[PDB]
Design an enzyme around this catalytic site. Structure first.
Site, PDB file in Angstrom:
ATOM      1  N   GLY A  56       0.865  -1.166   0.000  1.00  0.00           N
ATOM      2  CA  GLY A  56       0.000   0.000   0.000  1.00  0.00           C
ATOM      3  C   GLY A  56       0.906   1.221   0.000  1.00  0.00           C
ATOM      4  N   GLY A  67      -0.242   5.051  -0.929  1.00  0.00           N
ATOM      5  CA  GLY A  67      -1.181   5.809  -0.119  1.00  0.00           C
ATOM      6  C   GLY A  67      -0.606   7.083   0.475  1.00  0.00           C
ATOM      7  CG  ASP A  86      -0.875   0.706  -3.887  1.00  0.00           C
ATOM      8  OD1 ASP A  86      -2.004   0.545  -4.406  1.00  0.00           O
ATOM      9  OD2 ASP A  86      -0.677   1.423  -2.883  1.00  0.00           O
ATOM     10  CB  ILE A  87      -4.155  -3.075  -5.479  1.00  0.00           C
ATOM     11  CG1 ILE A  87      -4.957  -3.967  -6.433  1.00  0.00           C
ATOM     12  CG2 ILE A  87      -4.904  -1.776  -5.196  1.00  0.00           C
ATOM     13  CD1 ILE A  87      -6.248  -4.512  -5.833  1.00  0.00           C
ATOM     14  NE  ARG A  88      -4.531   3.460  -5.459  1.00  0.00           N
ATOM     15  CZ  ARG A  88      -4.538   4.735  -5.080  1.00  0.00           C
ATOM     16  NH1 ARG A  88      -5.314   5.614  -5.705  1.00  0.00           N
ATOM     17  NH2 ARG A  88      -3.758   5.134  -4.082  1.00  0.00           N
ATOM     18  CE1 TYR A 146      -9.065   2.347   9.040  1.00  0.00           C
ATOM     19  CE2 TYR A 146      -9.597   3.875  10.821  1.00  0.00           C
ATOM     20  CZ  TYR A 146      -8.687   3.364   9.912  1.00  0.00           C
ATOM     21  OH  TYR A 146      -7.417   3.901   9.854  1.00  0.00           O
TER      22      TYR A 146
HETATM   23  N1  LIG Z   1      -3.798   8.667   7.145  1.00  0.00           N
HETATM   24  C1  LIG Z   1      -4.328   8.597   8.382  1.00  0.00           C
HETATM   25  O1  LIG Z   1      -4.779   9.759   8.986  1.00  0.00           O
HETATM   26  C2  LIG Z   1      -4.445   7.307   9.194  1.00  0.00           C
HETATM   27  C3  LIG Z   1      -4.806   7.366  10.566  1.00  0.00           C
HETATM   28  C4  LIG Z   1      -4.809   6.203  11.333  1.00  0.00           C
HETATM   29  C5  LIG Z   1      -4.443   4.998  10.728  1.00  0.00           C
HETATM   30  N2  LIG Z   1      -4.098   4.954   9.394  1.00  0.00           N
HETATM   31  C6  LIG Z   1      -3.712   3.652   8.823  1.00  0.00           C
HETATM   32  O2  LIG Z   1      -2.530   3.753   8.034  1.00  0.00           O
HETATM   33  C7  LIG Z   1      -2.584   2.844   6.925  1.00  0.00           C
HETATM   34  C8  LIG Z   1      -2.297   3.612   5.623  1.00  0.00           C
HETATM   35  O3  LIG Z   1      -3.257   4.631   5.519  1.00  0.00           O
HETATM   36  P1  LIG Z   1      -3.213   5.756   4.368  1.00  0.00           P
HETATM   37  O4  LIG Z   1      -3.715   7.041   4.949  1.00  0.00           O
HETATM   38  O5  LIG Z   1      -1.882   5.727   3.732  1.00  0.00           O
HETATM   39  O6  LIG Z   1      -4.425   5.196   3.457  1.00  0.00           O
HETATM   40  P2  LIG Z   1      -4.552   5.376   1.841  1.00  0.00           P
HETATM   41  O7  LIG Z   1      -5.962   5.131   1.479  1.00  0.00           O
HETATM   42  O8  LIG Z   1      -4.003   6.707   1.413  1.00  0.00           O
HETATM   43  O9  LIG Z   1      -3.561   4.264   1.227  1.00  0.00           O
HETATM   44  C9  LIG Z   1      -3.889   2.889   1.153  1.00  0.00           C
HETATM   45  C10 LIG Z   1      -3.145   2.281  -0.027  1.00  0.00           C
HETATM   46  O10 LIG Z   1      -3.390   0.876  -0.038  1.00  0.00           O
HETATM   47  C11 LIG Z   1      -3.665   0.459  -1.362  1.00  0.00           C
HETATM   48  N3  LIG Z   1      -4.524  -0.751  -1.371  1.00  0.00           N
HETATM   49  C12 LIG Z   1      -5.872  -0.806  -1.171  1.00  0.00           C
HETATM   50  N4  LIG Z   1      -6.267  -2.092  -1.297  1.00  0.00           N
HETATM   51  C13 LIG Z   1      -5.201  -2.860  -1.595  1.00  0.00           C
HETATM   52  C14 LIG Z   1      -5.047  -4.227  -1.810  1.00  0.00           C
HETATM   53  N5  LIG Z   1      -6.079  -5.087  -1.888  1.00  0.00           N
HETATM   54  N6  LIG Z   1      -3.785  -4.662  -2.103  1.00  0.00           N
HETATM   55  C15 LIG Z   1      -2.678  -3.819  -2.146  1.00  0.00           C
HETATM   56  N7  LIG Z   1      -2.842  -2.474  -1.935  1.00  0.00           N
HETATM   57  C16 LIG Z   1      -4.096  -2.002  -1.672  1.00  0.00           C
HETATM   58  C17 LIG Z   1      -4.308   1.661  -2.039  1.00  0.00           C
HETATM   59  O11 LIG Z   1      -4.186   1.583  -3.434  1.00  0.00           O
HETATM   60  C18 LIG Z   1      -3.544   2.842  -1.409  1.00  0.00           C
HETATM   61  O12 LIG Z   1      -2.390   3.258  -2.173  1.00  0.00           O
HETATM   62  C19 LIG Z   1      -3.967   2.167   6.994  1.00  0.00           C
HETATM   63  O13 LIG Z   1      -3.852   0.984   7.762  1.00  0.00           O
HETATM   64  C20 LIG Z   1      -4.762   3.166   7.820  1.00  0.00           C
HETATM   65  O14 LIG Z   1      -5.898   2.585   8.400  1.00  0.00           O
HETATM   66  C21 LIG Z   1      -4.113   6.089   8.621  1.00  0.00           C
END
Ligand SMILES: NC(=O)c1ccc[n+]([C@@H]2O[C@H](COP(=O)([O-])OP(=O)(O)OC[C@H]3O[C@@H](n4cnc5c(N)ncnc54)[C@H](O)[C@@H]3O)[C@@H](O)[C@H]2O)c1
Ligand SMILES: NC(=O)c1ccc[n+]([C@@H]2O[C@H](COP(=O)([O-])OP(=O)(O)OC[C@H]3O[C@@H](n4cnc5c(N)ncnc54)[C@H](O)[C@@H]3O)[C@@H](O)[C@H]2O)c1
Lengths: 312, 312
Positions: B9, B12, B35-37, B143
């Site tokens: 991922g 993200g 990443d899946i994307r 979530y």
């Molecule tokens: N950003 C925040 O404020 C925040 C806060 C608390 C916890 N988190 C945790 O941090 C982690 C990352 O969050 P983020 O903000 O970067 O989220 P995000 O949505 O920006 O990134 C997630 C990434 O995972 C990829 N993904 C989705 N499904 C997939 C799959 N099946 N296989 C491979 N890749 C896949 C997406 O393409 C994306 O690039 C998550 O566990 C999230 O719950 C984030």
């Protein structure tokens, strides 16, 4: 109109008594017993019985349709001790069987659900005496984790989809009609069979391991009463703390000695001791008593008497 | 040897900065982004990249083998707001991707794991100010439920299988390099883009909604530092409370106004308000500061300054 009940996992320690009591209250054919095991037990022959695998959504949906079910009591699941021997399968069964039943309610195919949680939802960091309804919960067993997630989802389905799902966190249960399924509190049942059969018992928990317990008659009354209560009285949609007794092996063994003076007990704690040590000693179930008038009837003395009468 | 890292991922909001920093510290080719994307992003082209679906165990296992991976940062999951739109898929992705990574560690195919939790694990009954490491946790979102169960399983795998998995409950994160993925705290990022682009913003949270926040630079430092710490300093195996800032939309808007005088803000709360209302306002992260020396660097003032410099 009386409800049309489907008990999943009816051949279990609780299911056996639950099915009998429900049939006395609502009629033999209004209560359908189902289980993956079909034995020539009393519950199977004393009314409508259906083989079913709670892991299969279609099989449950089919029974709901052919028996026009309105209420489902989902009792199928692997218990605390047994689940540790197969984490993957326990998680699969305990969670997915609940999702199937919850989804049936979401789809309006059934009206009400009873799903029991357990004191196993509590962990090492949970206050050990008079544990509150709302407190710290960090279960250290696969079982406890499944029950905690189960509670969270029951509340979610209620709050988001309006599903009428009711639950209670049963403490360790004691019965005489059917063997336990491998819980950590099973010694409180075994001790009776060995005391009566051999006049001695080797306990798998140390002598002063204080735990929350309840006689099956009480557990059954609780289950039926929370389900028959008006919906506006069910204020907690996760699961209700439920209490009756709290005692140590030394205490229950001593109560038995009043009936069997020659009874002796030795202590050989095994892996189950680690599970017990992560649980509370006593539970505060005030919300249950206040919301739907929960009240237990058996204490250590009356339960011991009733057990010995049934077993000897 | 330096660690061979696989970031799942990596494209993200967090993954973008995490991959960059890890590559600066351990070398570009020692960090594999997946990443899946696969977009024309700077992440994909700045080093080894692999398309992967975290829900497919064999695909992850193959990358671990072909890249001789030792460490895995599992960032793939659906966020708080987005998850509510697809509960079933969110539960599936968030839980099973974690099981796959934990199982790879159980099989000793990898050595260490970083998996982030969230402040979303807290619920309506959770104390709102200076939330303790150990407290009541009844998440009301899909979530939050997934993060809570995830924490329980991480602790289980550590305690039962000896897996070295580390986690932190990130508060709402703010960054300038990549857009947020649909969290409830995303307004803290959007407000900058709209303040700079249109000099006006329509906030989806009410003005006095105080929430726990953290600048991405700090969140990245925290992630790498907890992973770099010697194993004996990691005393909590579920997930660590982590903090930096707490503020309301009114406060961050006022801070932005110091840089963009003509900036105006209006409030039009939506379903995301109900999520925020179920979360704490400030977090107590002393366990993290004492166990592995966590120390944040940015406050509202310094973060606002840095964001505006990057965006204008
Ligand atoms: N950003 C925040 O404020 C925040 C806060 C608390 C916890 N988190 C945790 O941090 C982690 C990352 O969050 P983020 O903000 O970067 O989220 P995000 O949505 O920006 O990134 C997630 C990434 O995972 C990829 N993904 C989705 N499904 C997939 C799959 N099946 N296989 C491979 N890749 C896949 C997406 O393409 C994306 O690039 C998550 O566990 C999230 O719950 C984030
Ligand atoms: N007995 C207790 O002390 C206790 C304590 C707290 C909570 N509970 C909860 O009460 C419920 C029933 O407990 P019990 O003690 O009666 O357990 P049990 O093990 O005695 O009974 C379980 C029954 O479910 C059946 N079953 C298993 N897999 C099935 C499947 N795939 N499809 C259909 N049926 C299946 C079994 O054959 C068995 O008859 C469980 O949810 C348990 O977690 C029990």
């Amino acid at each position: 109109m009386n409800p049309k009940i489907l008990i999943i996992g009816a051949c279990g320690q609780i299911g056996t008594e639950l099915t009998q009591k429900l049939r006395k209250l609502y009629g033999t054919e209004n209560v359908i017993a189902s289980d993956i095991r079909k034995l020539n037990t009393d519950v199977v022959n004393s009314g409508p019985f259906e083989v079913v695998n709670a892991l299969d959504f279609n099989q449950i949906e089919h029974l709901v349709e052919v028996h026009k079910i309105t209420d489902i009591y989902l009792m199928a699941a692997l218990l605390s001790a047994t689940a540790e021997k197969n984490p993957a399968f326990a998680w699969d069964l305990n969670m997915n069987s609940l999702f199937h039943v919850l989804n049936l309610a979401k789809a309006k195919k059934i009206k009400k659900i009873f799903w029991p949680s357990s004191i196993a939802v509590f962990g090492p960091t949970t206050p050990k005496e008079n544990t509150p309804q709302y407190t710290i919960m960090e279960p250290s067993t696969v079982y406890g984790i499944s029950k905690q997630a189960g509670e969270r989802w029951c509340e979610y389905y209620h709050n988001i989809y309006g599903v009428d799902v009711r639950s209670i966190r049963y403490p360790g249960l004691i019965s005489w009609s059917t063997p336990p399924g491998g819980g950590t509190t099973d010694y409180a049942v075994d001790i009776f069979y060995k005391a009566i059969a051999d006049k001695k018992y080797e306990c798998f928990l140390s002598s002063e391991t204080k735990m929350p317990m309840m006689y099956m008659d009480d557990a059954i009354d609780a289950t039926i009463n929370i389900m028959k209560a008006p919906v506006e009285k069910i204020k907690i949609h996760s699961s209700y703390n439920l209490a009756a007794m709290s005692f140590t092996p030394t205490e229950i063994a001593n109560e038995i000695k009043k009936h069997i003076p020659e009874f002796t007990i030795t202590y050989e704690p095994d892996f189950r001791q680690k599970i017990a040590d992560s649980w509370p000693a006593s539970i505060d179930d005030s919300q249950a008593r206040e919301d739907w008038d929960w009240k237990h009837t058996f204490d250590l003395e009356s339960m011991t008497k009733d057990m010995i009468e049934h077993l000897s």
